[PDB]
Structures are given as C-alpha cells and as structure tokens.
C-alpha cells in the first residue's frame, strides 16, 4: 500500500502543526456531519492534512476615497508555538486557488486579484515565519450612487427650481429653500450609516457638503433678493483704479439676481461635478 | 432547513446472529463504529441538535446493513440574482458529499 487515506480520527493521534491565523477576530472549523478534516500518509512519511475553515479576519480600511476606495485585505498565519528555528512554512507552486471569484458574497466589492508573501516577525517568544495572502478588493459604485449621489443632486436641482418661481411668492420660495436644506441634513445623516465613525472627510462627505453649500447659497440668494427688493425698498495713463478696479457704476443691478442665478448655479454645479468625478476616477 | 439526514451502508464486520433481526441501539455506538464523513459543500454553520440527547439513531441488521440517521439544521448558501426583485425566483442548492474519500 502506497498511501493510507484517513478521516479525522488520527488527526489528534499524530503530531499536527499548531498553525494559527494571526489577524483572525473569530475563526472556527466545521463539524457537520463529522469534522471536515482529511489525512493522508504516504510510505515515504509524507503527511498531508487538510481541513475546512471559516475565518473572520480583520482588515484596517482607509476610507478616504470612499466609495471610490480600494483595499488589499490580508490573511496571515504562522505557527503559534514553534519559532523559525523549529517550523518553517513555504508556499507551493500554485498555492492560493480560487473557483468562481464573482459568485461570492462580495456585494459592495469586486475581487481584483491576490498575491502571497512570506516574512519573519520578531516577538518576545522568538522569530516566527509569517505567511500572508493579500486579496485586492475594489468597491462598486451602484448602491451608493442609488442611495446618496442621485438624491443629493436631485435636491440641489429642486433648490434650483426656486429661481424660476416669482419672487413675490415669499412663503413658497422660503419653504422650498429651507425644505431643500432639511432634506440635505437628512441625506448627510443617512449617508454615514454604512461607514464606521471615522474622524476624516470622505469623498461622499465632500460631495454632500458641497451640495449643502449649493442649497444654502440658493436660500441666501433668495433672502438677499427679497430683502433688497421689498423689505429694504500707467502705460494707458488711465487712473489705475479706473483701469483695473471698478468704481464706475459699482448694487444697482440687484433685481436681476434671479436671472443671474438661473444660469450661474447649474454652471457651478456642473463644473464641480466634472472636476470631482474626473479627479476621483482618473487622476487619482 | 431542518432535516432528518439518513444514510445507510453495508459493513461486513458488523454481521451477527441473535434473537433480534435488527439492533435498534443507542447513538453512542456511532462514535465506536465507522460512519461516512459527509459534509455540505455550500453549508454555513450547520447545527447538530443535542437536546435532550444527541438526535441520532443507529440500527444494525443481521446481514451487516447499517442505517444511521441524524437531525440537523442545515444553513446553506443560496446565491441570488436580484435584477428582477421583487419579481425574482431562485434555485437554492443543497450539495453534500464525502470530505476525505474520493470517488
């Protein structure tokens, strides 16, 4: 007989490496119906020991570019007891295999690839050979685009709708502006729910913050218009202040602020969106 | 899914002759005899119920036919395609087989 093929009975009978996963928050084997382990002993003394595992491994995420963020989550393992002078691990030729990559439970992420490495880590007990597998994940924009980006832009456009209402419609325009500012506060509040309580601004935070300023500038614009309309009422040899600055005429052209805003606000928002998306998608 | 998972197989070593044709024994005999190492490929933290006793039964026929049943709460993967949600329909698999023994 060239090989003894055995179930989990002799796993506890023979010596087994004390391999443990360093970055595991919680891991557990499988025991249904029987222990999901396998042993195979060859005549030359080669032992092959396989087991099924499910590991909850920690992965410190940098969410500055969220939802345009990419991560390389690790999975590290080593011998718990035996230092580098006692046990040495080694990757095989084709060590990390995968089946159907995009049939997995990754809903918000897509699997780009993986890479394995080995190193030596010094601890109080000794130096240990640590074997790492990094999985590269890239976030997908669909859910967050549905949830935050589209509603915020739509509320900004709803704020723009106020510019086309008659300025004498004071309750209508005031309610429209303040209501748009409310729905922004609420959208900001709910945009953060998926994330942890990090203390830095993300891309989504920046977008929602700029959408807030555009909805607040619209409300302040109507307030100023209403107050000023109803409630209140030397190579040239030119002088440099006349040549450069403007003391001539100027304000007077204040009733046309709605006409100015109707074109100004969409242009500013379009420029902001263009620079934002280009910068986050292509330049960085 | 809560299941009675039943398996049966021949074991010539466990042949006997006696007053009874079948030995409806305590489940403790299962740990003492060989049983298949069946596992669920798409399972996710299944449970073998153990109240009051281990919910297993073993029966040995005089010709060496083993019947071995266990109660399980299998918890398996059902990958879903939610494009047609809530008008969507799925086919959840339940796949099982031996872990250590090849074909």
């Amino acid at each position: 007989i060239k090989v003894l093929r055995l179930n989990s009975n002799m796993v506890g009978k023979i010596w087994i490496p004390d391999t443990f996963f360093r970055n595991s928050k919680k891991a557990d084997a499988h025991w249904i119906t029987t222990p999901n382990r396998m042993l195979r002993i060859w005549n030359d003394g080669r032992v092959l020991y396989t087991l099924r595992l499910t590991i909850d491994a920690e992965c410190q995420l940098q969410l500055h570019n969220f939802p345009m963020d990419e991560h390389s989550c690790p999975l590290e393992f080593s011998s718990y007891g035996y230092p580098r002078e006692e046990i040495v691990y080694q990757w095989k030729r084709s060590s990390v295999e995968v089946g159907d990559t995009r049939s997995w439970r990754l809903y918000q992420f897509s699997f780009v690839g993986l890479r394995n490495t080995t190193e030596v880590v010094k601890t109080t007990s000794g130096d240990y050979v640590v074997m790492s597998v990094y999985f590269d994940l890239s976030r997908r924009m669909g859910y967050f685009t549905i949830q935050t980006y589209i509603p915020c832009t739509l509320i900004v456009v709803l704020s723009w709708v106020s510019f086309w209402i008659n300025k004498d419609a004071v309750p209508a325009r005031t309610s429209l502006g303040i209501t748009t500012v409310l729905t922004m506060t609420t959208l900001s509040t709910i945009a953060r729910k998926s994330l942890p309580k990090v203390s830095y601004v993300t891309a989504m935070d920046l977008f929602v913050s700029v959408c807030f300023i555009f909805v607040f500038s619209a409300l302040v614009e109507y307030g100023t218009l209403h107050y000023f309309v109803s409630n209140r009422k030397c190579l040239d040899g030119k002088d440099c202040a006349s040549f450069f600055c403007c003391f001539e005429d100027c304000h007077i052209r204040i009733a046309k602020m709605d006409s100015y805003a109707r074109i100004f606000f969409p242009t500013a928002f379009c420029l902001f969106n263009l620079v934002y998306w280009v910068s986050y998608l292509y330049l960085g | 899914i809560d299941v009675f998972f039943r398996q049966s197989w021949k074991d010539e070593r466990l042949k006997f002759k006696g007053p009874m044709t079948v030995l409806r024994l305590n489940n403790l005999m299962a740990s003492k005899i060989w049983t298949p190492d069946t596992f669920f490929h798409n399972g996710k933290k299944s449970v073998a119920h153990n109240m009051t006793m281990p919910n297993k039964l073993l029966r040995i026929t005089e010709d060496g036919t083993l019947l071995y049943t266990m109660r399980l709460t299998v918890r398996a993967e059902c990958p879903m395609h939610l494009e047609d949600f809530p008008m969507d329909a799925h086919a959840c698999p339940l796949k099982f087989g031996s872990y250590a023994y090849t074909r």
């Epitope: 089946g99 159907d100 995009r102 049939s103 | 990958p79 395609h81 086919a91 698999p93």
Partner: nanobody
Amino acid sequence: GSLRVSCAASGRTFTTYIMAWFRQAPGKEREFLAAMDQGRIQYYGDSVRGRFTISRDYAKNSVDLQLDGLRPEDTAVYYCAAGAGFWGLRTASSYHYWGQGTQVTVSS
C-alpha cells in the same frame, strides 16, 4: 476520435450562471449532454457519462467540452447554453441563453 469544443461568452458575466452543453441531431429534441455549476460541480448525461468531460474557465468566462470515443451515432449539432437553473439543470427550457451551434460528424 478525440475532439474539443470551446464556448466563450461575451457581453455578460456567465461565471455565476450554470453552463451546459446540449445536442440536437436532425429530427431530435435538444438533449442534455453536460453541465457545470458555479461550485465547479459537473453533471453528465447517462449516454455520455465517462466519455465526454466538461470544464470551465471562470476568469476567461468560457466552458469547454472534450469529446472522447467519438462514434458515427454521435454526429449532431452541439449547442452551448447558459442560465440560472430553475425547474431545470437537465431541461433546455431553464437556460435563457444559447449559442449558434456547431456541427460534428464522424466517418468510419
């Protein structure tokens, strides 16, 4: 004789769909030859069990079928199919995507 039939998919990610191979000679209904699931599990028809072998490349989004022991009763049109297996995995109705088909003939 030995032969290999490949089927590459484009325009949609068929990795997460069960991918199958079918046969249809003239004056015959489309019959199931082979299939492979997302979990690398292979099903074969009783007529072709042990002769033909189905494999899949998920990175390339393709399904291959190696035909061995070809016989002159085997000549037919071979179709590549893919879909979610609902009420099926052995019936043509459950597959929502099909290929053009390829003719195969054996001459003794």
